[PDB]
């Protein structure tokens, strides 16, 4: 508390507060409709003056009166886009955006149109990207989801219903408040989905309370009815049964099916089964990669349209919009907030970013797609997702084990933490029976928890894939670079370099670079060019370097010539993008139409290159990939051959690389050529790769979904195979029980085509190349609570016998049996008729006695006459609820049954086409709103859909179009609407 030590130094006091206020700077500090996006331009401003003056270039002021621009304004909804002109704008915010648009697009478009050196390929790719920008901007007009509705007052516009609209490719920060009428007239299906989304049958708060008492699951041999979608296949149905049986035992699992089998459809159908069948409709979270997330969104839109699936991406304000407009049914409360959504789709980045706002949610299910990202137990995603309070988890992946058993240990610890332990690593040098016993124990321990289906087990039309390992001899430059690096020779590695800045850290990386190409090193092309091309550097020698600097490039050139001779297309996969640059320049000076994909390419140009390569009229021959890019969603159906230039440490990356072209539905026999350098560092790379492949074939492949005696022999055989090295009509495009099939795709075929310096670029190639160089110089260049709750349902719907399931699951009834609620409704309806007739019998005899007394008093005047006038000018208790309307209960029951039978008899296909016919009701011209016979049919249609007395639901229903005709000093009101409903039903009946 009090300080026990002080300072005897007599210093002055110092104010240490460094907090500053800028209130002395307000003299120069303080004392929403503008141009935001410009989309399209039109060559005619007002009218077509003529076709003259079509030559030359316009200036900036010339385009100010010649073009009209499509404008999306600030805080607008991409539907109020206006075709404006510079003189029609005046001076608003965002004029610099319009100037930049006009300058850049008009100047560059007329420059590429009017230039003489622009080819047809450039003009068609700029037209294609212009059309891509045009229909990408045109996609913003279509709504995608309606968030919330409000009643807002305009400038003397009384009250207007106003929807919160999300668009197709826009996010929740572009969600806008718009009129209900044009949204209904534009996309009424989303309006009907929104109207289903208020009074939905499935809520998180109505979920079951299964606490280790889940019901037994019977096997489903048919597709369930609540999964509408398309059609479910047999293997997907067995996966559904496996997931349901695993959840019935309270166990977590890994769906280890191969890519292309439709794992998304399987988990969407399992979520639908968990919501509809087992009534576990609480908050579920699905964590997916961002690139595949539209492929999950359309799957939820197609297969489970009745679900409240929401998307969680974007910046801070969009996630805030999702958080306080869509998470809770009651966002304005302060106590316990229950959830509104059913499924939350999100990514890893917003799990890490918003773990506080998402970890405090009692989730019922987690589904993590691409669980190999979760392969590390030390990563931040692992501790973020492992801290979640989720009862049941599921991991969806294609490769459960990639490097060793520690990764699979991390996955099974994330699934269920503690009954499964792995502490002993595997060693191929031991090969004892105890290791085989451990492997069989791991086989029998994770067998029901992993379901794996291969592409060779289902869809019996897939052509086989055979990969060939080719080993080539290094060049002299590669050999001397390998000798200089391995026996480090910094002075010799510098040599003729002026800078001489060589880094020999990561020795194995430099050895791999030397095994790939000497041109990866700095100042290395000059030494090859001066010693072989005689210093002239005139094109043809430089490419002559590019084939003979590396020992793999001669085999690659021979393979490209052989595949150009045939009708085949080739993908080239590399680990380094600088090698991709080397091959890109090799095909550039070579003159082959190539396309490329790496990490530097943005996703728009990636999609452009993928669609250009997959087009049926594609002139592209070779497509280059960096191996670890693009995700699992790259479609490369048109290609036939895959060449792995650099072997990955992880073989699952190479399997994904060869499965880029080996997808479901491939019409050609796919071969993979793996380019290997002899007696270099890539040999132990392939040794580690085949060790990991042997491990994956041991654990994962033998535990999918009299042979147990031969299992102890074939595990020993595969461990003897894994303990030995492999290093002790060649490029044919042809190929002519499963235990010896894995003994294939591992042999090494050597290649010793020693070709001299001058024997490449022959007289056919040299004549066309020298002519192009010569032509270039010429061209330069039931209690009481249930009784009152059922009484409110009688005034809304009517009879509770046929609507017992509707009121119970919507919260209008308590947690009780359906037969107990049905029996209480029938007893109250029967007792209402007897109590109504008891009071009406005594009232009839009262007026007879009062009329007799009035006749006696009439002769005295020629009092009792006032007694007869007062009498001339129905409540009961059923189950403790007093003053119940016994007369109105039977009248509303008969009126609702007559209205429901009349609508279904003649307007079963469409209830909005109901007409009153020749029946003319009383006029309602004294009301403040224009009420006609068309408005009377709209009110009666909403009574059979929303219920009687639901004035808020009738006014918010914009299908009838009576939102502005009802006020809730204005007429008609709530009391006037109730009287007109009873008078219309009594007149028709």
């Amino acid at each position: 508390k009090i300080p026990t030590r002080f300072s005897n130094r007599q210093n002055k006091t110092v104010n240490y507060n460094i907090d500053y206020s800028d209130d002395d700077l307000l003299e120069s500090e303080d004392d929403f409709h503008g141009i935001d996006i410009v989309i399209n331009h039109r060559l005619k401003t007002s009218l077509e003056e003529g076709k003259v003056l079509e030559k030359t270039v316009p200036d900036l002021n010339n385009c100010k009166e010649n073009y009209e621009f499509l404008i999306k304004w600030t805080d607008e909804s991409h539907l109020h886009n206006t075709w404006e002109t510079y003189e029609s704008i005046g001076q608003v915010r965002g004029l610099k955006r319009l100037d930049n648009y006009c300058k850049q697009f008009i100047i560059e478009d007329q420059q590429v149109r009017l230039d003489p050196y622009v080819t047809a390929e450039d003009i068609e790719i700029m037209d294609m990207e212009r059309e891509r920008r045009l229909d990408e901007f045109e996609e913003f007009h279509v709504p995608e989801r309606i968030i919330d509705s409000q009643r807002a007052s305009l400038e003397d516009g009384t009250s207007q219903l106003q929807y919160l609209v999300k668009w197709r490719r826009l996010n929740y920060d572009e969600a806008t408040w718009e009129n209900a009428t044009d949204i209904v007239k534009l996309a009424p299906e989303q309006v009907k989905h929104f109207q289903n989304r208020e009074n939905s049958k499935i809520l998180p708060q109505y979920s079951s309370n299964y606490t280790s008492q889940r019901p037994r699951f019977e096997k489903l041999s048919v597709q369930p009815p609540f999964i509408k979608g398309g059609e479910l296949r047999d293997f997907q149905l067995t996966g559904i049964n496996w997931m349901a049986f695993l959840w019935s035992k309270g166990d977590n699992g890994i769906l280890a099916d191969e890519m292309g089998l439709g794992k998304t459809v399987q988990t969407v159908a399992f979520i639908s089964w968990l919501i509809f069948a087992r009534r576990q409709n609480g908050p579920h979270i699905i964590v997916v990669p961002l690139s595949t997330m539209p492929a999950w969104l359309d799957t939820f839109e197609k297969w489970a349209p009745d679900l409240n699936c929401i998307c969680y991406m974007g910046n801070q304000k969009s996630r805030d919009t999702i958080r306080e407009y869509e998470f809770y049914t009651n966002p304005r409360a302060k106590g316990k907030k229950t959830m509104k959504f059913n499924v939350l789709l999100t990514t890893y980045e917003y799990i890490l970013k918003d773990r506080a706002e998402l970890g405090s949610i009692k989730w019922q299910f987690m589904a993590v797609d691409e669980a190999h990202r979760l392969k590390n137990a030390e990563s931040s995603l692992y501790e973020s997702l492992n801290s979640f309070k989720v009862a049941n988890r599921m991991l969806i992946t294609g490769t459960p084990l990639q490097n060793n058993i520690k990764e699979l240990a991390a996955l099974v610890n994330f699934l269920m933490p503690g009954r499964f332990t792995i502490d002993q690593e595997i060693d191929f040098e031991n090969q004892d029976e105890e290791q085989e016993e451990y492997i069989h124990d791991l086989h029998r321990r994770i067998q029901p928890f992993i379901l794996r289906r291969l592409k060779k087990d289902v869809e019996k039309s897939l052509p086989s894939k055979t990969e060939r390992i080719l080993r080539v001899e290094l060049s002299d430059v590669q050999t001397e670079y390998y000798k200089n690096i391995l026996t480090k020779n910094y002075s010799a590695l510098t040599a003729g370099a002026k800078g001489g800045h060589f880094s020999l850290l990561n020795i194995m990386n430099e050895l791999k670079k030397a095994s790939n190409h000497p041109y990866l090193f700095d100042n290395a092309e000059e030494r090859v060019l001066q010693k072989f091309g005689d210093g002239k550097m005139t094109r043809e020698n430089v490419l002559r370097g590019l084939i003979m600097s590396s020992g793999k490039m001669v085999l690659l050139d021979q393979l490209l010539t052989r595949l150009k001779k045939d009708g085949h297309r080739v993908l080239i996969f590399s680990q380094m993008v600088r090698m991709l640059d080397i091959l890109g320049d090799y095909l550039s000076i070579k003159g082959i139409n190539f396309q490329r994909l790496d990490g530097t390419v943005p996703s728009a140009q990636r999609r452009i290159s993928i669609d250009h390569f997959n087009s049926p009229d594609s002139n592209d021959f070779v497509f280059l990939l960096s191996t670890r890019a693009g995700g699992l969603g790259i479609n490369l159906m048109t290609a036939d051959t895959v060449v792995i230039f650099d072997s990955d440490w992880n073989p699952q990356a190479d399997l994904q690389a060869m499965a880029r072209a080996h997808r479901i539905g491939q019409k050609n026999h796919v071969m993979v050529y793996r380019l290997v350098s002899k007696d270099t560092v890539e040999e132990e790379v392939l040794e580690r790769a085949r060790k990991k492949m042997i491990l994956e074939y041991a654990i994962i492949s033998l535990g999918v979904t009299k042979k147990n005696e031969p299992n102890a022999g074939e595990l020993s055989a595969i461990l003897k195979f894994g303990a030995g090295n492999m290093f002790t009509d060649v490029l044919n495009h042809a190929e002519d029980l499963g235990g010896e099939e894995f003994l294939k795709q591992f042999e090494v075929t050597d290649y010793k085509a020693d070709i001299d310096w001058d024997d490449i670029i022959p007289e056919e190639e040299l004549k066309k190349l020298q002519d192009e160089e010569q032509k270039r110089k010429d061209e330069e260049y039931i209690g009481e609570s249930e009784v009152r709750a059922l009484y409110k349902a009688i005034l809304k719907f009517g009879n509770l016998k046929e609507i017992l399931d509707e009121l119970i699951a919507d919260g209008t009834l308590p947690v009780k049996s359906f037969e107990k609620y049905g029996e209480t409704y029938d007893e109250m309806m029967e007792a209402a008729k007897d109590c109504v007739h008891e009071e009406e019998k005594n009232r009839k005899e009262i007026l007879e006695k009062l009329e007799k007394h009035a006749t006696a008093y009439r002769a005295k005047l020629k009092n009792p006459l006032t007694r007869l006038s007062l009498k001339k000018r129905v409540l009961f208790n059923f189950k403790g609820v007093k003053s119940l309307n016994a007369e109105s209960l039977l009248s509303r029951v008969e009126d609702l049954k007559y209205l429901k039978n009349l609508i279904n008899s003649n307007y079963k296909d469409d209830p909005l086409k109901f007409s009153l016919g020749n029946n003319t009701p009383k006029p309602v011209q004294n009301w403040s709103s224009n009420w006609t016979k068309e408005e009377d049919e709209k009110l009666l249609i909403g009574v059979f859909k929303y219920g009687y007395g639901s004035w808020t639901q009738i006014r918010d229903d914009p299908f009838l179009g009576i939102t502005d005709k009802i006020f809730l000093k204005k007429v008609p009101g709530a009391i006037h609407l109730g009287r007109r409903v009873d008078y219309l039903l009594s007149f028709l009946r």
Binding site: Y20, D22, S28, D30
Partner: protein, 97 residues
């Protein structure tokens, strides 16, 4: 509403003198340190704390140099600093001497 030229600079002066974060990005400074180090010898590894200590040393040295430079510019009846102010500061400090 446009601001007078000078009050924004005073706001940044009052803002950056309060906070103590590093005003130079980490990766360009690491690249600069490695480029400067690699001419003395090749194959140099760097601890993260070593580059951080070099960063705060550069921060303190350059902030003190701009204080001396601002004093030189104010002494020359100016509010704009110039390279002649910098070479005066370093000379009087003895760095150019």
């Amino acid at each position: 509403h446009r601001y007078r030229p000078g009050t924004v600079a005073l706001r940044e002066i009052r803002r950056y003198q309060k906070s103590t974060e590093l005003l130079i990005r980490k990766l360009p400074f690491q690249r600069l340190v490695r480029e400067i180090a690699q001419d003395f010898k090749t194959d140099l590894r760097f601890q993260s704390s070593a580059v951080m200590a070099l960063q705060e040393a550069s921060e303190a040295y350059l902030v003190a140099l701009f204080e001396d430079t601002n004093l030189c510019a104010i002494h020359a009846k100016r509010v704009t600093i110039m390279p002649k102010d910098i070479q005066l500061a370093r000379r009087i400090r003895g760095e150019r001497a």
